[PDB]
Amino acid sequence: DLELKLSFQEGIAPGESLNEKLDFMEKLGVVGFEPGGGGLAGRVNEIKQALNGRNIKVSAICAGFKGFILSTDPAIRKECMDTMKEIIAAAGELGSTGVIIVPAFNGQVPALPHTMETRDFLCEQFNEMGTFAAQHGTSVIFEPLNRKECFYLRQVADAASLCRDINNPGVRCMGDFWHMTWEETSDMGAFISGGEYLQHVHVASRKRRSMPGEDGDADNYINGFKGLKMIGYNNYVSFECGCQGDRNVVVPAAVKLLREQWEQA
Amino acid sequence: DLELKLSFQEGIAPGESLNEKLDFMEKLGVVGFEPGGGGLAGRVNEIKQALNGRNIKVSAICAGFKGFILSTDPAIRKECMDTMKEIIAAAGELGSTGVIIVPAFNGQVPALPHTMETRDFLCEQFNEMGTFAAQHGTSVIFEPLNRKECFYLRQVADAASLCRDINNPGVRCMGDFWHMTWEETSDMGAFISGGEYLQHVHVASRKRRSMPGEDGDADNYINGFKGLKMIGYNNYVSFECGCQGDRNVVVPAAVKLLREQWEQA
Numbered sequence: 396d397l398e399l400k401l402s403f404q405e406g407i408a409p410g411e412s413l414n415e416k417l418d419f420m421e422k423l424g425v426v427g428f429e430p431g432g433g434g435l436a437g438r439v440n441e442i443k444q445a446l447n448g449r450n451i452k453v454s455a456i457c458a459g460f461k462g463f464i465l466s467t468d469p470a471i472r473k474e475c476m477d478t479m480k481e482i483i484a485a486a487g488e489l490g491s492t493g494v495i496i497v498p499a500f501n502g503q504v505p506a507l508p509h510t511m512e513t514r515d516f517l518c519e520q521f522n523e524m525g526t527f528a529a530q531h532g533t534s535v536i537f538e539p540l541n542r543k544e545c546f547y548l549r550q551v552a553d554a555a556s557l558c559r560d561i562n563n564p565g566v567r568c569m570g571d572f573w574h575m576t577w578e579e580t581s582d583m584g585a586f587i588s589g590g591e592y593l594q595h596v597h598v599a600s601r602k603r604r605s606m607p608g609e610d611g612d613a614d615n616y617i618n619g620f621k622g623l624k625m626i627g628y629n630n631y632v633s634f635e636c637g638c639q640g641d642r643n644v645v646v647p648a649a650v651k652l653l654r655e656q657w658e659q660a
Numbered sequence: 661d662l663e664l665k666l667s668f669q670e671g672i673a674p675g676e677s678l679n680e681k682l683d684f685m686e687k688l689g690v691v692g693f694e695p696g697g698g699g700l701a702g703r704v705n706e707i708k709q710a711l712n713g714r715n716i717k718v719s720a721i722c723a724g725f726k727g728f729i730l731s732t733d734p735a736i737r738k739e740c741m742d743t744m745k746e747i748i749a750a751a752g753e754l755g756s757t758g759v760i761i762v763p764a765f766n767g768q769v770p771a772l773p774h775t776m777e778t779r780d781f782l783c784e785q786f787n788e789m790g791t792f793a794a795q796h797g798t799s800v801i802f803e804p805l806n807r808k809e810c811f812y813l814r815q816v817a818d819a820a821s822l823c824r825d826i827n828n829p830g831v832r833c834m835g836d837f838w839h840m841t842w843e844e845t846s847d848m849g850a851f852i853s854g855g856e857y858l859q860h861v862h863v864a865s866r867k868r869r870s871m872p873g874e875d876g877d878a879d880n881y882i883n884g885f886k887g888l889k890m891i892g893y894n895n896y897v898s899f900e901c902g903c904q905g906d907r908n909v910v911v912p913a914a915v916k917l918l919r920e921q922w923e924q925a
């Protein structure tokens with residue numbers, strides 16, 4: 396009886412305003428809304444007010460911070476910490492499951508070397524953001540990406556181990572089915588390793604990163620869904636993807652597909 | 661109905677000769693023997709002769725190569741490749757499931773940096789190793805170790821992804837329960853990620869790396885065993901560990917404990 400809690404990033408639903416998109420999401424029973432972190436503090440009232448009376452809640456906050464935490468430049472690491480804290484505080488007000496963060500993209504250089512001593516440093520920095528997140532009633536969430544976008548953190552099991560070592564309820568992780576296609580031999584095993592640390596999930600079609608279903612037989616999430624069920628996953632599965640067809644047609648088709656696959660898992 | 665195929669490294673069983681140790685192994689129904697690869701070519705006759713008429717086969721070959729494949733010194737990398745090929749040919753003559761290899765230990769320096777370019781080079785080298793091993797009816801087996809011994813390759817999911825990318829019937833991976841204690845949030849998840857590439861398993865007590873059971877309640881392999889059953893694992897589970905107590909008492913106890921947990925999984 397575990398529920399699939401679907402969520403959408405802000406650009407997913409058709410509509411000319413935030414309220415039109417939310418109406419569309421309510422029609423489909425999509426219960427999570429995932430905004431970007433950019434300017435979030437200034438959007439708290441807008442978002443709260445649009446959600447009032449709806450069966451929709453803020454799920455994760457997708458990034459939005461400046462700089463990156465593995466820069467060799469302490470000023471850039473501080474920029475990342477400071478901008479993350481601004482977002483975290485707004486995320487807390489919005490009841491968010493947490494703020495998504497990539498430690499370093501490929502092109503974010505110069506970066507600290509990929510060594511154990513750097514990993515310890517990352518864990519310390521994340522412990523500091525997590526303590527702040529927890530005070531604000533939220534978390535920070537490591538996102539692994541595939542090799543085309545990052546090398547540092549690519550697999551859910553790696554992110555989960557970081558979280559276990561940090562041992563902070565404000566420090567969690569996630570898996571993105573797009574990235575997992577390229578970096579996980581098993582979506583199920585990855586999510587199982589995620590376990591109690593798995594705070595969010597991203598979903599997209601698995602060849603073109605468009606709406607689930609637009610890549611036909613490649614868009615198979617059953618193995619991952621079996622992992623989510625085995626861990627009792629109770630957070631959101633949120634769309635982060637493009638769109639090839641007519642959004643009024645393909646968005647509902649994606650929701651239908653994920654629900655069918657959830658039932659089969 | 662999946663069977664647990666127990667194996668011992670050479671120093672596990674009590675005895676003053678290889679034949680005495682094998683006699684002890686047969687009495688406990690341990691069917692796998694795991695010798696080190698050091699001077700293996702020169703022991704092929706010895707091992708064949710000792711195994712004649714016995715219900716014991718060679719399982720994996722534990723390392724034995726010189727140098728390391730991630731050295732910045734081409735001569736050291738070549739030493740690794742050349743000595744691995746010697747061992748691989750002997751492994752094949754002995755019907756081994758594969759030769760275990762760690763890309764780089766912490767003290768093996770200077771080493772290539774942990775970057776995507778190094779990962780590509782590692783894949784090229786293992787592909788060469790694997791083509792040779794397949795020709796000889798065996799494999800090479802990546803072993804992830806914990807942070808106290810290595811940084812480069814620590815998790816089963818990472819090793820499995822290397823195997824998937826290399827895509828060679830001669831290149832496989834393993835999990836060692838000792839190392840997994842420190843590097844895996846889920847033994848089940850780790851082995852599920854291992855999947856079709858999982859070729860061997862090491863077992864030890866989980867606090868002091870001694871005989872299973874010597875660390876009491878910490879010596880729980882159920883979760884991992886569930887993962888092995890879920891993937892239809894049909895290779896060996898091999899003891900690589902020390903011994904705190906009377907070897908004549910604690911070795912049979914460890915075998916008994918593992919068989920009990922396997923039945924519970």
Ligand SMILES: [Mg+2]
Binds near residue numbers: 571597
């Ligand atoms: Mg994502």
Ligand SMILES: [Mg+2]
Binds near residue numbers: 803836862900
């Ligand atoms: Mg081992």
